[PDB]
């Protein structure tokens, strides 16, 4: 199968700047390279077709170049609507194969997260489970580490993280980390803490609570 390798994984740039995305193939594909744009919750849209031709109707700032195994998509000057995921596709032979995608992301200034921790509700406990939620709100850039400690013991394997898309207004991320325990396990311990490390903080930040108090 023909392998398509995109670079970089994420490209963080400001509107008005040039963006150059790369797609390398594992073997020659007779220049049958195609590029797609996709935004969250939408179908991909064709930008460039075989022979490096810009699809009619697509803005002129998009262009494709390259040959052999080395292909490029260039956006001469990024507009707000250009921040998206871009995929390459070879249509030279079957199986048809896509690159793994490049996310073009909105560069903004660093913003530390505001951290909040929420104990499980009484109503959830009544149903027999305990989810402890740690919220990291409105931060940039995307990279953040969250660690759970229960009576000062580091947890592993019992938490799940989820992240929003960049906010439409301020271009920040928010992230939830949820620690899930049975009610019985939740009741075996008193102190619950989430520790957050992020570039915008001068030191890690811990938010915590004790099951024995309000």
């Amino acid at each position: 199968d023909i392998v398509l390798t995109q670079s970089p994984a994420t490209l963080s740039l400001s509107p008005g700047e040039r963006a150059t995305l790369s797609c390398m193939t594992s073997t020659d594909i007779d220049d049958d390279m195609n590029w797609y744009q996709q935004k969250p919750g939408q179908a991909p849209r064709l930008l460039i077709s075989e022979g490096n031709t810009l699809r009619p109707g697509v803005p002129a700032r998009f262009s494709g170049s390259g040959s052999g195994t080395d292909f490029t998509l260039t956006i001469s000057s990024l507009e707000p609507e250009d921040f998206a995921v871009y995929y390459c596709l070879q249509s030279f032979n079957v199986p048809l194969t896509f690159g793994q995608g490049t996310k073009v992301e909105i560069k903004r200034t660093v913003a530390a997260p505001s951290v909040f921790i929420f104990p499980p509700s009484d109503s959830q406990l009544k149903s027999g489970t305990a989810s402890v939620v740690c919220l990291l709100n409105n931060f940039y850039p995307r990279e953040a580490k969250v660690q759970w400690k229960v009576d000062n013991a580091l947890q592993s394997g019992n938490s799940q993280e989820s992240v929003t898309e960049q906010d439409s207004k301020d271009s920040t991320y928010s992230l939830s980390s949820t620690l899930t325990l049975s009610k019985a396990d939740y009741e075996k311990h008193k102190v619950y803490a989430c520790e957050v490390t992020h570039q915008g903080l001068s030191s890690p930040v811990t938010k915590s609570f004790n099951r024995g108090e309000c």
């Binding site: 596709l89 896509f98 995608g101």
Partner: protein, 225 residues
């Protein structure tokens, strides 16, 4: 306008592992028999993956190794319709399935895409979420939210105050839990001075179960500030 190229998928939805589904895609805005067609899928949070293609005349077909022998692509040129029969389904086949048109007589490169239809393969039965408050308690602003837990399948929709509250709302993508059910939270930041005065209600709708839950989120009773 009648010039609009449309590819409308149907037949997706719920199935158990080992079960079968048949997707249909009804096309308009072009002469159907003149174009090759393909199915492409996208697993949640993942990239595009080609599934199968079929030639104009329908007598020649191509499959990815992942689906070969299980899936069959076909077309009915008298009905402008493309099919994907999906047998012996597995959990890894869960994805949005897109119908696509090949852009030329020699290429399956996709030029038009349908909106896609979600196929979820699982042992789980359809179930509406349980909704739990994330009670508030920071520069005069507080965070609160709702935990939307243990539902199946995707998707759910969350609004706040019947859609009147949108500023500062973040609703996280769902995570598939080891129980086979999905969970997510939705949070919002609000003036602290509004707590106990403004009512905050998360409106949670889950179409597959025909459930709607409105959960009021208030400060804990032990909170007196």
């Amino acid at each position: 306008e009648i010039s609009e190229v449309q590819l409308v998928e149907s037949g997706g939805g719920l199935v158990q592992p080992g079960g079968s589904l048949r997707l249909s895609c009804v096309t308009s805005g072009f002469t159907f028999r003149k174009f090759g067609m393909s199915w492409v899928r996208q697993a949640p949070g993942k990239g595009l993956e080609w599934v199968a293609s079929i030639v104009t005349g329908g007598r020649k077909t191509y499959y990815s190794d992942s689906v070969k022998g299980r899936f069959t692509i076909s077309r009915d040129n008298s009905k402008n319709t493309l099919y994907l029969q999906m047998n012996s389904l597995r959990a890894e086949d869960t994805a949005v399935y897109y119908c696509t048109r090949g852009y030329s007589s020699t290429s399956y490169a996709m030029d038009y895409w349908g909106q896609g239809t979600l196929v979820t393969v699982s042992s789980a039965s359809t179930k509406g979420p349980s909704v739990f408050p994330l009670a508030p308690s920071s520069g005069g602003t507080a965070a609160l939210g709702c935990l939307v837990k243990d539902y199946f399948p995707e998707p759910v929709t969350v609004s706040w105050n019947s859609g009147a509250l949108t500023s500062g709302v973040h609703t996280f993508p769902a995570v598939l839990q080891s129980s086979g059910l999905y969970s997510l939270s939705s949070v919002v930041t609000v003036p602290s001075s509004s707590l106990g005065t403004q009512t905050y209600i998360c409106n949670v709708n889950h179409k597959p179960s025909n459930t709607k839950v409105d959960k009021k989120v208030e400060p804990k009773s032990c909170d007196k500030s």
